[PDB]
């Protein structure tokens, strides 16, 4: 009966419940001794079929699962009604769901999950404007149109939007002598002053528009080979607004020749300043450069996260390598090869867009101690994913359903209040609220009324038909009051006999009922009404307490289901005993502890294999023609399973063969065959001889 | 904890001048001590210097009220008029405006060096702005001022070192050599360079700006991929080596391709002897350096911060996390992977930004060191982490926390921002630490506390106590006193010679939650009594005797459970103030609490005294040993005693050998059949328990049967040696007087003999058959048998002897003629015999030995006797050379044996 309920020892019925789930409380406790605590009312559901009654009082809550509302998406996309509005349609099925956290007992849900076959798509193109790149500026003023006819195919929503990226202004990066200032390049050529964050323009559904604005950018540049692309791809996100970003898909073409610096680079500038992530930009124009520190790679990751912000980058083979590794932090982003003049920009955005819409992750909100979260999932062509695979599934093609079970486990009932949480996938404006309602109630305790007479005037809870005795009171009554102004004659409940030590000399007695004294060794407070019993003192099968497996129940050694004896250690294994022919301790004997007693006259060994006085196999082995066939005389074919074979004159004479005399008597001639270690191989002559 | 947290000295500067930004210990100790605090964007007064920057230092005074900045520069910046007379003007060949002057401030002996990296130079023949980066060398209490511009040279632009800021990262050797590392020469590669104090102030000229110095050491130049490696970010001083020279540590941000590393180079050599790469990409690894012992091996360690590392918690969102890193050096090898490492919960922490030395702290004999978290803390006003020194090494764990007194306010207090440390301010044998806070403009200076540890020892001689009897009687009521004494001894260094204690001592603590206490002091007529005691340093433990007297009433029901005496103190609160103002600690180790407890005298006797008088022989039964036998010896022991009562747990241990091991005991007793036994193993010894009473009884004679089995142990060597004795609870004579049993163990071998004949191609078989079988535990080697017929298997021989089988043996005539196939007494001395001496190696226990012999009968010659009666007889003996045991004190088996066989007709 040992569990964590027992050993808890609970005070009421919330204490079975959070214990152990299947531990039951009965209120009715009619079984339960008054002597005994409330520990003994809790018993698991199968220990208290045991006791063959059941108690309709007792509570056994289950946790269950409830869904607020069951949308449906919108499927093949057939129809007016069909993705009418981006607010009116949902991808996901379930908006919201609710559910019941028990201990002990975990809690999955089914989520389905379609891609909508028409979805709008914003581009915002950040282009290093470094002299290098100048080549790749006058490709970007025609590149606008072609792109606007491509996208409409992929999209019947497309907006372009020009961003152009330089480096903060500081004394390191870019030359501080005015001469330099007013064109970072040589005199003869022609470069505008860099701006380490400038706007264009703004997203427009009309490509026409973009392509004039890009004509009247001039050709920048930057004395440091890494560029600061980094601090105006930050201000884009945060934003929001100012770059008119849709909930239409948002793809953050990040295009660049050099090195990106990151996180305090600022420090060779003087700027120790970390970057707030926060919207400063004034007509076009970002000038908090000189005043914030380049954001870390990190920070980046949280605001495009957070914005949903898909990150393509378009860089060259020369520093595809180093963009590669900063894949991995930054999620929803992907890498495509540039071509020195960006001819091939429009080929590379439209595979990169590919690669990232097929790619789907599912991210859940911040989760308090005690409650965790596991993710299972569905994927076409026989393909499951566990763990981080099991989280986000790939290859999702328009219009393909994929579902993710998912498997959240409370305990310990931290907060009473119900918890509200968001969960939803990037670049998805549609989210998954998991709401839950912890119920750490007991049925009966609110049936209870506290302060109920029949327990000496509610000297102790007497919630149902439990009464549970409070300080200073033990008993099923709790009258005693412990220790009184009057000294009283000690305590006639605590000993069955007057002249024995009060509660056998094991503890301190109080109230009519004997609480055992604490042992460091063993569990402090014995079981038992007299505190006769003890945890610590039965006998050891060999130099460990009950087999080392067992456990200790009023000094008594109780066996695990794979032993039996006083000792315990004794297994029920009787895997030992075997040997090779195949019968259990060979021809007799009886299997106990593991060690075979042979009970057969003269049989010794560990399988008594060793018995040379036993008669031979072939005069003691006679039944195999008088039992399988002929039967007569005793029984049987448990002992002679050998083979029989119909060998006629074989010229085996001495193995050893045997004579013996048959019913007309008849010599018959046979014998049992082994050649290596032990065989088994009958040859009864069928002839027969008279 | 020594650090004076609560009442850190606070240094003030002026507002925006970046106050507390470098903060170093120059000259300590000696005349006087003085802080140091650097000013990079304080306002000069230098003419057409802007936000230069300046170095103050702040006299130490019981109050800091005064503050002087360092007049490093009393001159404005060089014009050359030369070229100023040719050109319309005069332009500045150099600009002091934005020099971050103090931005690094490191001092060594009467030399403190100040550079500001900012601080740039315009070529005299053309306009080119680079970060040439300055320094001002002051030794000698400012004697002489001395101008050093390291990264200063002809190479101009991006290819030159013009971009250097030379002294951005600057650290002082022990001989005070000065090494200075700039991240922005060689189109910001990086550059380190180091000059003796001497040489620079040598080969400095003051008539030309720019000066080379023959023999000057810098790092070396590297390729286009190497560009933008930051080199020298942060420089640190270690030893690796062991030679004279001292290694530089200077740690590398963007190396490696944006991961970082940190190259260790020797001056003198002008290369890196070994480097370390950080694991976590972008990692920024060498951001923050510092080289120390940490784990009391006399070798320098080396501590690298990563603040940028971006760990995952369970949820998996990620947070700025970061990552402390130091490896503990050893003599046979540098390992590269990091020993340890140090994680902060702290979203956005950058912790580990500044890492400063605290020598050894708490005087354990290792060294700690401070970490600093610049957006550490949940108001991230800034926090600083103090580890423990370990010899495995450095505690992950803090040893303690501190966090600014002042309310946060809305502009990043950047605490953290540098840390100082290892060196004794007041020279009060505990090392300080100065935390540099640049964002509120102020500089906060940590002072120790000397450490005292005390131990508390409470012992009871007359804990005996009896209620029929009182020693002590009170004119009001007689009840019994126990006299009660504690001692307790104090030790430390800078301590005062009497320091203030508070005992407390508690009678029947376990009583004292609401119940009646059953012990209380005589003197007050109270449970609990408190007091101060003046100890002395050096002082003998003093054990004051108190009497506490037990009640004598019917209102406890209870009196079986025993009192409990608990004594606890702690250091007085209200300390006497010092002359050097740090108040005394008790070290977290040193216990101050004492448990006891005392059990009444119950039955002792008319006086209530308790002595008993146990007696014990044993003997054993079986007691020769059969080795590789399954031995069984069952111990007969006879305990009594013939002494008084009050050996309570009265119990017979049995210390068994290896070999030896425990089945059951079974006593004589009445009242118990089979006396409890439980196993010992904690014991060295295997030691069986079995307990003869609860209650001492006096004449209680107890005769112990124990049956114990002896798995096999040949390793013995001897004869077992088994120990038994009886102990007892009692404070006298508690123990039995020991009895050692020796058994002997002599291995036994038993062969038996056993023959028969199948009897008793022309001829009837005949078959003999010689069994031995060692039914004796112990295997014997070269076991010889010796078998023989009275044939010599001939044709003129009556028997022909086939073959012989089950064992090697070898006959002197062929075994095999060709191929395998009134009475007379036919018997091996009438005829040829033909004797076969066989010999049997491999032997076990319970093996089975069996000779076939299989001699047929030739007709020819039975023919030649037409009506006679033929008895074949054959004999075999047997012997067994020699055994395989240590011992064999024996006699070796051996015997004989007769088969025969009738023929009739
Ligand atoms: C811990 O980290 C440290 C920092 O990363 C490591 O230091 C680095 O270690 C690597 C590997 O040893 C070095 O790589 C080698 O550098 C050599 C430097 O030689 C050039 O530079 C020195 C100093 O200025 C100069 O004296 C030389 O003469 C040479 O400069 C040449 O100058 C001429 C002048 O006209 C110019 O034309 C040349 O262009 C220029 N050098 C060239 C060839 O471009 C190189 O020589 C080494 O090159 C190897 O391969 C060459 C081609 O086959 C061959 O010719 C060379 O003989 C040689 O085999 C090689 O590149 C890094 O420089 C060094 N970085 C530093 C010091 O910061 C440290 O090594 C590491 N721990 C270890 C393992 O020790
Ligand atoms: C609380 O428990 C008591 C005692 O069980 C209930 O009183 C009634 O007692 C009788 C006799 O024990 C119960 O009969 C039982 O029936 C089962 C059937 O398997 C049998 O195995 C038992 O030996 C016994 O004969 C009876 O069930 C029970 N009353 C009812 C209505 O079942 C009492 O009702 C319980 N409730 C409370 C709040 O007291
Ligand atoms: C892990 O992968 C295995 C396949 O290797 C999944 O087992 C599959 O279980 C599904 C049902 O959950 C079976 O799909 C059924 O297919 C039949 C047609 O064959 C269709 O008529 C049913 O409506 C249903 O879709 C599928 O046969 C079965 N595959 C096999 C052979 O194992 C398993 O479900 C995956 N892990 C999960 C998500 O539990
Ligand atoms: C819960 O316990 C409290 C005590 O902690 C009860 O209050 C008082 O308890 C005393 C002792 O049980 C009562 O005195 C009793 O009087 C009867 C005769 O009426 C006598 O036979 C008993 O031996 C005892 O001396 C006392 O009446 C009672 N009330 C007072 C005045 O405080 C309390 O009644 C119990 N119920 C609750 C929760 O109110
Ligand atoms: C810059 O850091 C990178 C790691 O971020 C280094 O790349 C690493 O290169 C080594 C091979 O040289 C790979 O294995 C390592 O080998 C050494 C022995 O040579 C061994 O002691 C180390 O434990 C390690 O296994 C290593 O796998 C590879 N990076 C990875 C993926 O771990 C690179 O070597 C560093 N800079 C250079 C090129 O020296
Ligand atoms: C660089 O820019 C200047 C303008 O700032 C150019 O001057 C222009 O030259 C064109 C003819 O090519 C004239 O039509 C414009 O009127 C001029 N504008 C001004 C403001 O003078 C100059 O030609 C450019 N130089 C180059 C291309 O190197
Ligand atoms: C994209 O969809 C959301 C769905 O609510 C639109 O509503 C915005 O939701 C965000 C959630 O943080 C709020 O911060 C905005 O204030 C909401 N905007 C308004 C005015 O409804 C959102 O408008 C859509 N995208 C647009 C048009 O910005
Ligand atoms: C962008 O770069 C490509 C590089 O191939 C240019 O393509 C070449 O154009 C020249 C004429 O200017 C042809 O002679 C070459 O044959 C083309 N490439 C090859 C390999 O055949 C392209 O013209 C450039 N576009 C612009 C105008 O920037
Ligand atoms: C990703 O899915 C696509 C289908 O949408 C796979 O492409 C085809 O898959 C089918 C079914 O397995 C095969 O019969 C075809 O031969 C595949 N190729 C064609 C012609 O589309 C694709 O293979 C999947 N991912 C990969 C490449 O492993
Ligand atoms: C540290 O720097 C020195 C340069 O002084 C390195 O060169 C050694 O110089 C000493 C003379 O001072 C020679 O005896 C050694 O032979 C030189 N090095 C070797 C081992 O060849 C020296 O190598 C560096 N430290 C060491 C010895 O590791
Ligand atoms: C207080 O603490 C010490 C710690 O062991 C006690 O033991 C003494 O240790 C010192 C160490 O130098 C020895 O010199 C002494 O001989 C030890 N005690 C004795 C018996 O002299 C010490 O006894 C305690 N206080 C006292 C009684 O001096
Ligand atoms: C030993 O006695 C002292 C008496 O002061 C106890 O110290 C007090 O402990 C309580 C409970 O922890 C605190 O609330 C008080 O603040 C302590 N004293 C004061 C007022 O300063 C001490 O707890 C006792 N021993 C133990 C177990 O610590
Ligand atoms: C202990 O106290 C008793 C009085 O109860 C006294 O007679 C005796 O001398 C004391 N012994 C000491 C102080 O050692
Ligand atoms: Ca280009
Ligand atoms: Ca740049
Ligand atoms: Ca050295
Ligand atoms: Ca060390
Ligand atoms: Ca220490
Ligand atoms: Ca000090
Ligand atoms: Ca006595
Ligand atoms: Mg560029």
Redesign the interface.
Same mark, same amino acid.
């Given at each position: 009966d040992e569990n964590r309920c027992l050993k808890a020892n609970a005070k009421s019925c919330g204490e079975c419940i959070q214990a152990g789930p299947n531990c039951g409380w009965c209120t009715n406790s009619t079984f339960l001794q008054e002597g005994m605590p409330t520990s003994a009312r809790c018993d698991d559901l199968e220990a208290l079929k045991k006791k063959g009654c059941p108690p309709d009082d007792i509570e056994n809550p289950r946790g269950s699962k409830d869904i607020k509302k069951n949308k449906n998406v919108t499927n093949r996309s057939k129809g007016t009604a069909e993705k009418l509005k981006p607010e009116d349609i949902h991808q996901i099925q379930p908006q919201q769901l609710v559910l019941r956290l028990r201990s002990g007992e975990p809690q999955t849900f089914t989520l389905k999950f379609k891609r909508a076959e028409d979805y709008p798509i914003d581009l915002y193109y950040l282009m290093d404007l470094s002299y290098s790149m100048k080549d790749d500026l006058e490709n970007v003023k025609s590149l606008g149109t072609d792109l606007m006819n491509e996208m409409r195919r992929i999209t019947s929503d497309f907006r372009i939007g020009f961003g152009s990226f330089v480096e903060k202004t500081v004394?390191?990066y870019i030359?501080?002598?005015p001469a330099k200032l007013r064109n970072p390049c040589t005199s003869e050529q022609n470069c505008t002053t860099p701006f380490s964050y400038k706007n264009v323009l703004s997203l427009t559904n009309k490509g026409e528009v973009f392509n004039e604005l890009v004509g009247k950018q001039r050709i920048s540049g930057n004395?440091?080979?890494?560029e600061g692309g980094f601090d105006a791809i930050m201000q884009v996100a945060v934003c929001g607004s100012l770059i008119g970003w849709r909930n239409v898909t948002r793809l953050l073409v990040f295009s660049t020749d050099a &090195?990106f610096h990151? +996180? %305090? =680079?600022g420090? $060779?500038g &003087?700027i120790? $300043?970390?970057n707030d992530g926060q919207c400063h930009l004034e007509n076009n124009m970002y000038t908090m450069s000189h005043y914030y520190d380049y954001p870390? /790679? +990190?920070?980046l990751?949280?605001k495009l996260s957070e914005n949903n912000i898909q990150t393509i980058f378009a860089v060259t083979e020369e520093f595809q390598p180093?963009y590669k590794?900063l894949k991995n932090?930054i999620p929803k982003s992907a890498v495509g090869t540039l071509s020195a003049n960006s001819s091939n920009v429009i080929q590379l955005i439209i595979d990169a867009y590919n690669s990232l819409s097929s790619e789907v992750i599912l991210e859940n909100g911040?989760?308090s101690e005690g409650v965790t979260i596991s993710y299972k999932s569905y994927c076409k062509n026989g393909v499951n994913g566990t763990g981080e695979n099991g989280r986000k599934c790939s290859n999702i093609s328009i219009g393909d359903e994929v579902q993710f079970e998912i498997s959240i486990t409370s305990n310990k009932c931290p907060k009473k209040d119900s918890d509200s949480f968001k969960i939803r996938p990037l670049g998805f404006t549609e989210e998954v609220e998991v709401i839950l309602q912890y119920i750490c109630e007991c049925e009966c305790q609110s049936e209870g009324i506290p302060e109920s007479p029949k327990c000496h005037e509610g000297n102790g809870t007497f919630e149902c038909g439990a009464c549970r005795c409070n300080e200073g009171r033990v008993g099923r009554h709790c009258e005693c009051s412990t =220790?009184e102004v009057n000294?009283?004659d000690? =305590?006639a409940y605590c000993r069955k006999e007057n002249s024995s030590?009060?509660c056998s000399?094991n503890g301190?007695?109080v109230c009519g009922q004997c609480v055992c004294?604490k042992r460091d060794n063993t569990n402090e407070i014995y079981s038992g009404k007299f505190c006769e019993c003890d945890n610590?003192?039965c006998d050891?099968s060999? %130099? $460990? /307490?009950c087999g080392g497996n067992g456990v200790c129940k009023c000094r008594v050694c109780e066996c695990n289901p794979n032993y039996t004896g006083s000792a315990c250690d004794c297994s029920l294994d009787t895997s030992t005993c075997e040997a090779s022919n195949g019968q259990i301790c060979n021809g007799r004997g009886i299997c106990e502890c593991g060690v075979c007693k042979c009970t057969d006259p003269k049989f010794? %060994?560990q399988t008594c294999e060793?018995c040379?006085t036993c008669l031979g196999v072939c005069a003691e082995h006679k039944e195999c023609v008088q039992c399988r066939a002929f039967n007569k005389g005793e029984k049987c074919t448990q002992e002679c399973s050998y083979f029989n074979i119909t060998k006629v004159e074989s010229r085996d004479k001495l193995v050893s063969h045997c004579k013996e005399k048959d019913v007309d008597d008849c010599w018959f001639y046979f014998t049992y065959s082994v050649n290596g270690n032990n065989e088994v191989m009958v040859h009864v002559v069928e002839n027969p001889e008279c | 904890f020594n650090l004076d947290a609560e009442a850190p000295a606070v240094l003030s500067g002026p507002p925006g001048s970046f106050f507390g930004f470098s903060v170093e210990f120059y000259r300590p100790g000696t005349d006087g001590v003085s802080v140091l605090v650097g000013a990079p964007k304080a306002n000069t007064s230098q003419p057409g210097v802007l936000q230069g920057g300046a170095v103050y230092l702040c006299p130490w005074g019981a109050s800091p009220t005064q503050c002087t900045p360092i007049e490093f520069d009393s001159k404005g910046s060089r014009l050359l008029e030369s070229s100023l007379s040719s050109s319309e003007g005069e332009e500045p060949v150099e600009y002091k405006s934005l020099q971050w002057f103090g931005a690094t401030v490191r001092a060594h002996g009467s030399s403190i060096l100040a550079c500001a990296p900012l601080y740039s130079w315009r070529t005299e023949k053309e306009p080119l702005s680079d970060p040439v980066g300055t320094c001002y060398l002051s030794t000698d209490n400012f004697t002489r001022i001395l101008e050093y511009a390291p990264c200063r040279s002809d190479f101009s632009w991006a290819a030159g070192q013009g971009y250097c800021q030379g002294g951005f990262s600057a650290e002082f050797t022990k001989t005070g050599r000065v090494v200075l590392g700039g991240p922005g020469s060689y189109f910001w590669q990086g550059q380190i360079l180091s000059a003796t104090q001497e040489q620079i102030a040598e080969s400095y000229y003051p008539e030309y700006l720019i000066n080379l110095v023959q023999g000057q050491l810098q790092t070396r130049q590297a390729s286009s991929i190497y560009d933008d490696s930051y080199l020298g970010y942060s420089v640190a001083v270690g030893e690796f080596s062991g030679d004279d020279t001292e290694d530089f540590v200077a740690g590398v941000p963007k190396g490696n391709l944006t991961y970082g590393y940190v190259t260790i180079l020797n001056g003198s050599d002008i290369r890196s002897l070994y480097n370390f790469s950080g694991e976590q990409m972008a990692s920024y690894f060498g951001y923050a350096v510092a080289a120390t012992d940490v784990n009391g091996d006399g070798l320098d360690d080396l501590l690298v911060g990563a603040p940028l590392l971006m760990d995952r918690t369970p949820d998996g969102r990620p947070q700025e996390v970061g990552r402390v890193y130091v490896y503990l050096q050893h003599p046979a090898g540098i390992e590269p992977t990091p020993t340890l490492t140090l994680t902060g919960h702290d979203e956005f922490g950058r912790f580990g930004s500044s890492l400063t030395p605290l020598g050894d702290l708490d005087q354990d004999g290792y060294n700690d060191v401070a970490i600093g978290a610049p957006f550490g803390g949940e108001t991230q006003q800034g926090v600083v982490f103090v580890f423990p020194g370990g010899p495995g090494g450095l505690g992950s764990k803090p040893s303690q926390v501190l966090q600014p007194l002042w309310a946060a306010s809305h502009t990043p207090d950047f605490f953290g921002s540098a840390l100082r440390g290892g060196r004794d301010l007041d020279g009060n044998g505990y090392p300080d630490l100065i935390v540099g806070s640049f964002g509120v403009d102020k500089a906060v200076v940590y002072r120790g506390r000397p450490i005292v540890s005390a131990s508390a020892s409470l012992t009871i001689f007359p804990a005996m106590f009896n209620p029929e009897e009182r020693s002590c009687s009170l004119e009001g009521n007689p009840v019994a006193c126990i006299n009660l004494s504690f001692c307790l001894n104090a030790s430390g260094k800078h301590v005062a010679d009497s320091i203030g204690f508070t005992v407390e001592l508690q009678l029947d603590w376990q009583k004292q939650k609401g119940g009646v206490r059953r012990a209380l002091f005589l003197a007050s007529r109270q449970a609990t009594l408190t007091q101060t005691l003046l100890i002395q340093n050096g002082a003998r433990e003093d054990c004051r005797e108190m009497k506490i007297y037990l009640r004598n009433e019917s209102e406890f029901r209870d009196k079986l459970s025993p009192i409990h005496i608990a004594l606890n103190f702690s250091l007085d609160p209200q300390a006497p103030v010092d002359s050097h103002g740090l108040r005394p600690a008790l070290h977290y180790q040193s216990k101050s609490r004492i448990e006891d407890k005392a059990q009444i005298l119950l039955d002792c006797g008319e006086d209530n005294i308790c002595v008993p008088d146990l007696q014990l022989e044993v003997f054993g039964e079986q007691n020769h040993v059969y080795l590789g036998d399954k031995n069984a010896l069952n111990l007969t022991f006879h305990a009594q005693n013939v002494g008084e009562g009050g050996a309570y747990e009265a119990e017979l241990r049995v210390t068994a050998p290896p070999e030896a091991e425990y089945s059951g005991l079974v006593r004589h007793p009445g009242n118990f059949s089979s006396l409890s036994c439980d196993y010992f193993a904690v014991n060295q010894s295997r030691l069986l328990v079995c307990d003869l009473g609860n209650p001492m009884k006096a004449g209680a004679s107890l005769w112990g049967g124990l049956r114990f089995t002896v798995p096999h142990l040949r390793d013995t060597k001897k004869t077992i040696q088994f120990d038994f004795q009886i102990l007892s609870k009692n404070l006298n004579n508690s123990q039995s007087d020991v009895v050692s049993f020796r058994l002997s163990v002599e291995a036994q071998a038993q062969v038996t003999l056993n023959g028969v004949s199948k009897p008793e191609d022309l001829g009837p078989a005949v078959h003999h058959v010689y069994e031995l079988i060692n039914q004796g535990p112990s295997s014997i080697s070269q076991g010889v048998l010796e078998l023989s017929c009275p044939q010599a298997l001939e044709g003129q021989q009556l028997l022909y002897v086939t073959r012989v089988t089950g064992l090697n043996c070898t006959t002197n005539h062929p075994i095999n003629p060709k191929g395998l196939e009134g009475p007379q007494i036919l018997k091996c001395p009438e005829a040829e015999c033909f004797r076969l001496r066989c010999e049997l190696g491999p032997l076990h226990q319970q093996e089975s030995q069996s000779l076939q012999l299989h001699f047929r009968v030739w007709a020819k010659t039975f023919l030649q006797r037409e009506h006679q009666p033929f008895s074949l007889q054959c004999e075999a003996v047997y012997k067994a050379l020699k055994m395989p045991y240590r011992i064999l004190p024996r006699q070796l088996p051996q015997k004989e044996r007769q088969v025969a066989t009738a023929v009739q007709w």
């Open positions: 004394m390191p030359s501080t002598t004395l440091d080979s890494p &090195g990151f +996180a %305090g =680079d420090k $060779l &003087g120790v $300043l970390p870390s /790679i +990190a920070h990751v949280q180093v590794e932090l911040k989760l =220790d000294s009283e000690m =305590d030590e009060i000399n301190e007695c004294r610590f003192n050891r060999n %130099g $460990l /307490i010794q %060994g060793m040379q | -």
